[PDB]
Amino acid sequence: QVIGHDQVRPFPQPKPVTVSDKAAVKFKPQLKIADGCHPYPAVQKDGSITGGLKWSGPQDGECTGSKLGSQIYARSAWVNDVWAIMYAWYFPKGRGFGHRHNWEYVIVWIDNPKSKNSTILGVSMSAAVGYASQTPPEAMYVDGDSVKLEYYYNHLLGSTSLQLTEDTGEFQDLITWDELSKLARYSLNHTDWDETLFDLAGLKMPLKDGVFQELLDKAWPF
Ligand SMILES: [Mg+2]
């Protein structure tokens, strides 16, 4: 069930059909890698999951990107009359000393996914302190409908985190929660990504059942 990180095959990004999928594609964020790994696929169609990378401090030529591509994930829901799109990225390891595996996320809060004029009302993310929310995001941080984020090491908090940025970032093929295979969805609901005995690394998969809704309520920026 566990396969090499550099061998996990991403899902292709389908042409979106459902209202939920169309909105998730429309508002796909972009990601600039300032520090650490590029994002990787965590799971493939048959449910096999990535083995990630052991933490081994500074290393040249590890996790710069899979030969098979990359991935970004999204799950969406109505929260207090606002449509929340939570995007998540997986990385094979993460600093802050560090750990195998990593997850980061950005929530794009929009008014109405069904509207041709759907609009970003807010953004929240896995920031170094709190969720670094903006309601709405400043224009300098948004490229069209795409929020610009940076994956970085915050050296004051000692955390691997996301922040908004003016700089252009990279896009990844999007697979939405509803369009995952049953097997892949099971693996993401059920895998423990934290190797510590007492779960101290904060490595819950942010889109999974019983984390997803709770995170949306915690991050609520309005
Ligand atoms: Mg982090």
Curated annotation (Swiss-Prot):
**One Gene Ontology term, aspect cellular component:** extracellular region
Entry comment, domain topic: Key residues/motif important for the effector activities are degenerated in most NLPs, including the nlp24 peptide consisting of the conserved region I (11-aa immunogenic part) and conserved region II (the heptapeptide GHRHDWE motif) that is important for phytotoxic activity.
Q: Where is this motif: Hepta-peptide GHRHDWE motif?
A: 98-104
Q: Name one Pfam family in it.
A: NPP1
Q: Where in the cell is it found?
A: Secreted
Determine if Secreted is one of this entry's keywords.
Answer: yes
Enumerate the PANTHER family for this protein: DOMAIN PROTEIN, PUTATIVE (AFU_ORTHOLOGUE AFUA_5G00600)-RELATED (PTHR33657:SF8)
InterPro entries, per database record: NPP1
Q: Which family does it belong to?
A: Belongs to the Necrosis inducing protein (NPP1) family.
Protein name stated in the entry:
NLP effector protein Pc129485
